[PDB]
Amino acid sequence: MSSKLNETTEAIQRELEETTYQFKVQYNEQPMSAESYLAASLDDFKHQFH
Amino acid sequence: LTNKYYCPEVFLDAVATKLAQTAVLFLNVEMLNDFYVRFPREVEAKLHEH
Amino acid sequence: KSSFAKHPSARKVISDAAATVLADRSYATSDGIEISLKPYKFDPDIQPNE
Amino acid sequence: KSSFAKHPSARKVISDAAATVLADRSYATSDGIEISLKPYKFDPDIQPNE
């Protein structure tokens, strides 16, 4: 395990790189939470109701 | 336009208009749209906390 | 013009919220604009119509 | 077509030099291109001439 630890660590850093890349190209790095989604959709509905 | 060094005014204004327009595109997407999305959430959170 | 004409404290909370969002996006907007301008920094070639 | 048709080692050195330069610059070009395209990902508004 200790031997494989270094190579695994470097590979994990890389896939952290690629996950970050997909986060950049497809969602433009927009942070998201459930509460933000709910609040935004509620305001959309309130504008429609207005 | 070939005597650009004889007419600095018009040359500098052409550069200014071009830079202004493409900067305007990137600005409108990034800053303006992020403001339209993040502003209400920040209002709600900060008002509630106050 | 809004309903928050009175209540200067809450009004300042709103204004400061807008200010903090704009401040958060300011740098990313600026740097992105510089990157988009990188080709016109090298050769801002001017067309006769421009 | 060059004089390095023979000497495949020297030829490989030249080829690898080109490859390592392009590889060094590749990331900055890609990321810069995605950032510059960020406004057209959102609204690739099509003009009648386009």
UniProtKB/Swiss-Prot annotation, chains C, D:
Q: Which residues of the full protein are shown?
A: 666 to 715 of 939
**Where is this protein found?**
Mitochondrion intermembrane space
Provide the taxonomic classification.
Answer: Eukaryota, Fungi, Dikarya, Ascomycota, Pezizomycotina
Q: What does this protein do?
A: Constitutes the soluble short form (S-MGM1) generated by cleavage by PCP1, which plays a central role in mitochondrial inner membrane fusion and cristae morphology. The transmembrane long form (L-MGM1) and the S-MGM1 form higher-order helical assemblies that coordinate the fusion of mitochondrial inner membranes. Inner membrane-anchored L-MGM1 molecules initiate membrane remodeling by recruiting soluble S-MGM1 to rapidly polymerize into a flexible cylindrical scaffold encaging the mitochondrial inner membrane.
The coiled-coil segments of this chain are: none
| Source organism per UniProt | Chaetomium thermophilum (strain DSM 1495 / CBS 144.50 / IMI 039719) (Thermochaetoides thermophila)
The protein, known as: Dynamin-like GTPase MGM1, small form
Superkingdom assignment: Eukaryota
